[PDB]
Design a protein around this ligand. Structure first.
Ligand code: THP
Ligand code: CA
Length: 129
C-alpha cells in the first residue's frame, strides 16, 4: 500500500472527511471502522475527534487498500493519515469507533485495528465504558 498526498476540504463526521485528491473532491469514508451516529452516545465525540485530528494536521495522506476504492454510495474508501497518524486506528484506540465493515480484499490493517480495539476495550474507554 502507499500513502498519497491529499488536501483537507472539510471534516464531515466521525468516519467521513472531504478531501481534494489529485485536484478533485472526494468524500472519503474510513476503511474498517464504524463511528456512532451524531444522535448516538459518543457520536459528537467521534466527530469532534476526527475534525480536530484532520484540521490540525500539516499533512493529510490517503492510502487505498488492495480492493475496491469506492463504495456503493460513491464515497472513496481509504485509510487516512494526519501527520503520519492513522485516523482509523486513532478512533478505534480511543473507543470512539468499532472495527466493522471488514470485507475480503480490503482488510490490510485489520489486525492492527483489532489490537487497538482490544486496548480500548480493556481500558473501558468511551463506547466500551
Ligand atoms: C466502510 C465501508 C462502508 N460501506 C458501506 C456499507 C454500508 O451501506 P449498507 O448498509 O447499505 O450496506 C455503509 C455504512 O456507511 P456509514 O457507517 O457511513 O453510514 O457504507 C461499504 O460498502 N464498504 C466499506 O468499506
Ligand atoms: Ca458510521
Amino acid at each position: 500500500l502507499h500513502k498519497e498526498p491529499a488536501t483537507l476540504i472539510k471534516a464531515i463526521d466521525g468516519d467521513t472527511v472531504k478531501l481534494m485528491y489529485k485536484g478533485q473532491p472526494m468524500t472519503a469514508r474510513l476503511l474498517l471502522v464504524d463511528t456512532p451516529e451524531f444522535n448516538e452516545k459518543y457520536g459528537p465525540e467521534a466527530s469532534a475527534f476526527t475534525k480536530k485530528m484532520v484540521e490540525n494536521a500539516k499533512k493529510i495522506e490517503v492510502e487505498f487498500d488492495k480492493g475496491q476504492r469506492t463504495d456503493k454510495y460513491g464515497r472513496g474508501l481509504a485509510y487516512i493519515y494526519a501527520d503520519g497518524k492513522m485516523v482509523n486506528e486513532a478512533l478505534v484506540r480511543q473507543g470512539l469507533a468499532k472495527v466493522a465493515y471488514v470485507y475480503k480484499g480490503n482488510n490490510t490493517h485489520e489486525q492492527l485495528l483489532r489490537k487497538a480495539e482490544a486496548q480500548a476495550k480493556k481500558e473501558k474507554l468511551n463506547i466500551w465504558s
